[PDB]
Amino acid sequence: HMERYDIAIIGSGPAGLASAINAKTRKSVIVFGSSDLSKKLTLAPVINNYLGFYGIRGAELQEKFKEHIDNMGIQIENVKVNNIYAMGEYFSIMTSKDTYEASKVILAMGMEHTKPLKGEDKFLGRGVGYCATCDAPLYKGKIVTIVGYNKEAESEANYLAELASKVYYVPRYKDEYQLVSAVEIVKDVPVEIVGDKKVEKLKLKSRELETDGVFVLKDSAPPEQLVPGLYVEDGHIKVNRKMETNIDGCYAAGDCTGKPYQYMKAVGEGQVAALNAVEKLYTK
Amino acid sequence: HMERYDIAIIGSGPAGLASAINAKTRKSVIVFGSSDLSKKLTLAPVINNYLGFYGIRGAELQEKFKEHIDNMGIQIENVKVNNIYAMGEYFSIMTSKDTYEASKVILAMGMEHTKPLKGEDKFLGRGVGYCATCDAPLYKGKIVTIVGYNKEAESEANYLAELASKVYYVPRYKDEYQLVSAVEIVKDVPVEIVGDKKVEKLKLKSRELETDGVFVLKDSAPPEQLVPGLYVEDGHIKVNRKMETNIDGCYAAGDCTGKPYQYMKAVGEGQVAALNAVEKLYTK
Numbered sequence: 001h002m003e004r005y006d007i008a009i010i011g012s013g014p015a016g017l018a019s020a021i022n023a024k025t026r027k028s029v030i031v032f033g034s035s036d037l038s039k040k041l042t043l044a045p046v047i048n049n050y051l052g053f054y055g056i057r058g059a060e061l062q063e064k065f066k067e068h069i070d071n072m073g074i075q076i077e078n079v080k081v082n083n084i085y086a087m088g089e090y091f092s093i094m095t096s097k098d099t100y101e102a103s104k105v106i107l108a109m110g111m112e113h114t115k116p117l118k119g120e121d122k123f124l125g126r127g128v129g130y131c132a133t134c135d136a137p138l139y140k141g142k143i144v145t146i147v148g149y150n151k152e153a154e155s156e157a158n159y160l161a162e163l164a165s166k167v168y169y170v171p172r173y174k175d176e177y178q179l180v181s182a183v184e185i186v187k188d189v190p191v192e193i194v195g196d197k198k199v200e201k202l203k204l205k206s207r208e209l210e211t212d213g214v215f216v217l218k219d220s221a222p223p224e225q226l227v228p229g230l231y232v233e234d235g236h237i238k239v240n241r242k243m244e245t246n247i248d249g250c251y252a253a254g255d256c257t258g259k260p261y262q263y264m265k266a267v268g269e270g271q272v273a274a275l276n277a278v279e280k281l282y283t284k
Numbered sequence: 285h286m287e288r289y290d291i292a293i294i295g296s297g298p299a300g301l302a303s304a305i306n307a308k309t310r311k312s313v314i315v316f317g318s319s320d321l322s323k324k325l326t327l328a329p330v331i332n333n334y335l336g337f338y339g340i341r342g343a344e345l346q347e348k349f350k351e352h353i354d355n356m357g358i359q360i361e362n363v364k365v366n367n368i369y370a371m372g373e374y375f376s377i378m379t380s381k382d383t384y385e386a387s388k389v390i391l392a393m394g395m396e397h398t399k400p401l402k403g404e405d406k407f408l409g410r411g412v413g414y415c416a417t418c419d420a421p422l423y424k425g426k427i428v429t430i431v432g433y434n435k436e437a438e439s440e441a442n443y444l445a446e447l448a449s450k451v452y453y454v455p456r457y458k459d460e461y462q463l464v465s466a467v468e469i470v471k472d473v474p475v476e477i478v479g480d481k482k483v484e485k486l487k488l489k490s491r492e493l494e495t496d497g498v499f500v501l502k503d504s505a506p507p508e509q510l511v512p513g514l515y516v517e518d519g520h521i522k523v524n525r526k527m528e529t530n531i532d533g534c535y536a537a538g539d540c541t542g543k544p545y546q547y548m549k550a551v552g553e554g555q556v557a558a559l560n561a562v563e564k565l566y567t568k
């Protein structure tokens with residue numbers, strides 16, 4: 001069904017966990033993200049600029065962070081947040097599973113490193129989107145191509161196969177893929193989304209797919225799509241010294257706020273966002 | 285004599301150490317402060333909001349920070365910084381011992397918690413000051429009272445006893461005091477600095493001292509006195525998202541920049557300041 005919380009934290013990396021441990025000062029808090037917290041932490045080899053942990057390996061620091069949240073009774077809700085609608089005094093939070101409401105939101109999604117595909121921006125809203133399940137009814141009986149950058153994208157492909165006339169899945173990571181037989185896996189490199197007034201084809205290095213929709217599925221939609229009305233410049237969510245965005249009650253912390261992309265900056269921002277959000281909840 | 289460095293960090297607490305470990309990316313760096321890093325860290329009992337160190341004691345976290353800087357060959361220069369003069373393209377740094385020049389400065393002095401004495405602001409520049417050794421020639425053959433909040437203040441009293449006709453030392457901490465016999469220790473509580481056009485007396489709870497100067501000696505002068513021309517509001521050094529102050533080449537990080545006074549905020553700010561300072565050194 002629906003569940004209400006005082007604070008929702010969108011991301012489970014350094015920034016979101018820093019927010020969570022500072023918000024547990026009560027005030028219900030929910031943290032959305034991945035079971036493994038942050039993929040970048042796991043991939044980091046030796047870390048020498050996180051003060052107090054000289055020479056730690058990324059996966060070791062990840063475990064220290066996991067034990068911290070576990071000691072404080074903080075769990076990660078393992079769902080993808082698709083859209084956050086600023087209703088004015090609260091936020092409606094749409095996810096890959098259930099819908100939530102929260103009084104305050106802390107954006108902590110990190111920063112996407114991969115570039116958009118050619119034609120992606122051009123056809124946005126004319127056949128390109130960032131949430132396949134959200135737009136699924138629009139593609140009933142149509143051809144849909146999903147360019148998947150994470151495992152959740154596979155679930156969206158499976159769902160779309162129940163409505164679309166044909167589903168192609170283009171993986172952008174190496175794994176076994178848990179897809180129903182109706183999904184055609186296209187192990188090729190996307191080149192360009194093309195069309196006249198709307199999407200007509202996805203061109204790949206060795207193949208072209210006639211398709212009505214192309215969904216580009218990453219850990220998070222671009223922030224201005226995830227949070228309609230949010231002020232972003234240069235792909236960075238713009239915040240002030242209190243980590244406040246342009247949307248009252250919506251904060252942002254970590255790589256999603258701009259450079260430098262470092263752990264200490266991220267945890268500091270998460271702390272500031274959470275303490276300010278809590279203050280606003282007690283002052284109304 | 286004088287020594288030149290690319291970056292000078294003013295403070296050895298969480299913020300300054302975070303700056304130091306991020307600036308050692310070369311670029312000579314000098315860190316001014318106390319041997320014990322930060323007094324607040326030592327006094328902190330259990331810390332649960334420093335991500336990755338759940339349940340750590342303050343002195344334990346202090347030791348982790350000490351081992352980090354030691355592993356990176358970062359030493360603390362154990363002197364008090366008295367004044368930083370923005371010369372335009374560099375900074376002249378006056379200390380309780382030698383003078384330094386630095387291309388970039390990172391202010392990391394923390395935030396003073398004790399309030400000013402009554403009359404302190406009123407007589408500033410008319411008998412009240414924050415550096416006794418700096419103003420010592422002005423008090424040759426005059427009466428000087430030092431209200432000392434740290435051990436360095438004792439050294440300043442000893443120096444002033446060579447020039448002033450009479451030196452009183454009013455300690456604001458419990459310890460043995462290493463003072464020459466010419467210094468009179470006044471174990472009483474300051475109440476008010478009084479005078480007409482200039483300082484004439486220090487009133488204490490049980491005694492009044494006729495005095496020509498009153499020096500209030502804390503770990504650092506107020507930031508607008510430490511750094512002439514620095515923009516401060518509400519006792520907080522005002523910085524932007526890059527930790528830049530109003531003075532080009534001068535950054536600030538940690539409690540000295542405003543609330544919340546927390547460790548994660550401080551280390552994040554120190555990191556941002558240092559990485560920006562380094563960038564400016566490589567771009568000129």
Ligand SMILES: Cc1cc2nc3c(=O)[nH]c(=O)nc-3n(C[C@H](O)[C@H](O)[C@H](O)COP(=O)(O)OP(=O)(O)OC[C@H]3O[C@@H](n4cnc5c(N)ncnc54)[C@H](O)[C@@H]3O)c2cc1C
Binds near residue numbers: 044048
């Ligand atoms: C190989 C490598 C080495 C690095 N080494 C260092 C180093 O030595 N020192 C250093 O300071 N920095 C280092 N970094 C950078 C550092 O990892 C980042 O600055 C830091 O991880 C930022 O954390 P964050 O919480 O802002 O974002 P992230 O760490 O990206 O966390 C984001 C998390 O939120 C989840 N999420 C995002 N959007 C949504 C959504 N819509 N719904 C649900 N969940 C979502 C993601 O799945 C992810 O788990 C390194 C990065 C890499 C890639």
Ligand SMILES: Cc1cc2nc3c(=O)[nH]c(=O)nc-3n(C[C@H](O)[C@H](O)[C@H](O)COP(=O)(O)OP(=O)(O)OC[C@H]3O[C@@H](n4cnc5c(N)ncnc54)[C@H](O)[C@@H]3O)c2cc1C
Binds near residue numbers: 320363392
């Ligand atoms: C009892 C107590 C418990 C606390 N518990 C927590 C907690 O659980 N979690 C949390 O997040 N925060 C806590 N805090 C607050 C936290 O300690 C501060 O936010 C943090 O120490 C800020 O560090 P900083 O580097 O900005 O300043 P500081 O820690 O004050 O470091 C300043 C250092 O620079 C030196 N210095 C200053 N001026 C000069 C100068 N002119 N020349 C030379 N050296 C100078 C000082 O001697 C000092 O050593 C606590 C504070 C106290 C007092």
